[PDB]
Nucleic acid binder design. Structure first.
Length: 224
RNA sequence: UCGGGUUUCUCUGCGUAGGAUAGGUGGGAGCCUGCGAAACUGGCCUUUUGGGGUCGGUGGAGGCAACGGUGAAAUACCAC
């Protein structure tokens, strides 16, 4: 159990908005190690059609307690511009053997302009239908594997949708401040309520709830 | 008796592989002694293919997830 002195201070009938929940989120987590509290939203527009899934990304503010994940595949003057920085698993053309041998937990596997065919002639039989490839309009295309892979540096990417009616993206950690849990919360209603491709209904935001390693939830308010 | 709603309580979810239905994210490695995990017999619920609960004989009480297995995710520990 262990449900008091952290839920006794919790009532699921009042409010705790932006400048208030931020000074009461790192609190409701007197459990074990570092404890992050989720930020819940509800995509319940119409959860059973192909044009209601948010097929886009989000970019976290500062620097989380994590790192940077990008398995580059390059050759030439792109190896010293991709190993002397801090990406992930970089070498040469043998990165088709590191992503077809027995491990695919890597992220945005980059390439080279004239070497896109390395992830299109050799890894379009396996890595083809994975939706994690470099193309000339989305993530990282061209010789931009040092400037806009910084969108994979300063911002936890993440792209997912479901079949029920719950969508909750993380802020990172609570190992910061009471003005930085609401600074990470200025990029979640700033990069997640913009999914309107084909058809939708009326009124989007309704309320908000929470989640930890021992809860709980004080319904977050909304406004200016 | 019927019409439904709301709220407390109650759980099915195998087109794929994956030993045993993972239902989702974060703390993804810890505590749990304070709120439905093992399968011998003519089963209800999923339908006499395997699988949570069983009514009772039958009678190892400490563990599991995982590296592996594995996939845009994994079978457990805490909640929405």
């Amino acid at each position: 159990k262990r449900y008091r002195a952290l839920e006794g201070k919790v009532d699921r009938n009042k409010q705790y908005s932006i400048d208030e929940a931020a000074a009461l989120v790192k609190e409701l987590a007197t459990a074990k190690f570092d404890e992050t509290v989720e930020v819940h939203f509800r995509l319940g527009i119409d959860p059973r059609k192909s044009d209601q899934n948010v097929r886009g990304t989000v970019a976290l503010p500062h620097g989380t307690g994590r790192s940077v994940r990008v398995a580059v595949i390059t050759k030439g003057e792109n190896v010293q511009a991709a190993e002397a920085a801090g990406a992930d698993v970089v070498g040469s053309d043998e990165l088709i053997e590191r992503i077809a041998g027995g491990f695919m937990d890597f992220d945005a596997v980059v390439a080279t302009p004239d070497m896109m065919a390395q992830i299109g002639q050799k890894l379009a039989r396996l890595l083809g239908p994975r939706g994690l490839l470099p193309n000339p309009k989305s993530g990282t295309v061209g010789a931009d594997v040092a400037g806009m892979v910084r969108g994979l540096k300063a911002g936890r990417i993440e792209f997912r949708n479901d079949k029920t009616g719950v969508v909750h993206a993380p802020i990172g950690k609570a190992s910061f401040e009471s003005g930085n849990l609401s600074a990470n919360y200025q990029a979640l209603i700033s990069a997640l309520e913009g999914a309107k491709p084909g058809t939708a209904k009326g009124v989007f935001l309704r309320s908000a709830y929470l989640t930890t390693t021992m809860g709980p939830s004080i319904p977050l308010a909304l406004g200016g």
